[PDB]
Amino acid sequence: NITIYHNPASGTSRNTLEMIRNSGTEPTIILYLENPPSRDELVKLIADMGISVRALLRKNVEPYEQLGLAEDKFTDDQLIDFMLQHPILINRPIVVTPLGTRLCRPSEVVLDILQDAQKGAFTKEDGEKVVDEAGKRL
Ligand SMILES: [Cs+]
Ligand SMILES: [Cs+]
Ligand SMILES: [Cs+]
Numbered sequence: 001n002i003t004i005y006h007n008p009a010s011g012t013s014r015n016t017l018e019m020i021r022n023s024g025t026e027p028t029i030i031l032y033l034e035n036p037p038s039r040d041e042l043v044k045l046i047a048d049m050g051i052s053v054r055a056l057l058r059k060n061v062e063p064y065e066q067l068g069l070a071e072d073k074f075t076d077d078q079l080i081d082f083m084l085q086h087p088i089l090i091n092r093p094i095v096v097t098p099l100g101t102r103l104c105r106p107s108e109v110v111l112d113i114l115q116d117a118q119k120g121a122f123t124k125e126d127g128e129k130v131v132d133e134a135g136k137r138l
């Protein structure tokens with residue numbers, strides 16, 4: 001039982017989603033830009049991911065620029081509420097499995113929380129080899 005907060009327009013997210021599938025599981029896909037987590041859910045995700053709230057913020061997007069978020073003048077709860085109101089600020093993808101939750105940047109971080117091994121070699125969209133046929137990480 002796996003959930004991915006996915007952005008089809010993200011190469012990292014597309015690579016992550018294909019690695020999930022290559023472990024033999026079809027995840028529940030949440031298109032977070034349109035169906036963001038609730039506050040409670042986002043707070044839990046952040047806790048489980050082991051990163052700071054700021055580390056989840058995606059840079060180079062309109063609200064990051066216009067709200068001035070690069071500046072260190074925001075508490076964690078201020079940043080969480082911005083993410084909820086502007087979901088493009090939530091970096092991607094976040095994956096939840098029975099083993100744990102991770103921000104899968106780079107995509108192969110997802111290998112930590114997938115329960116079943118990749119079923120064969122995996123190469124990212126751009127040609128970067130991730131696991132070989134034998135299952136060894138490169
Ligand atoms: Cs929701
Ligand atoms: Cs806009
Ligand atoms: Cs694992």
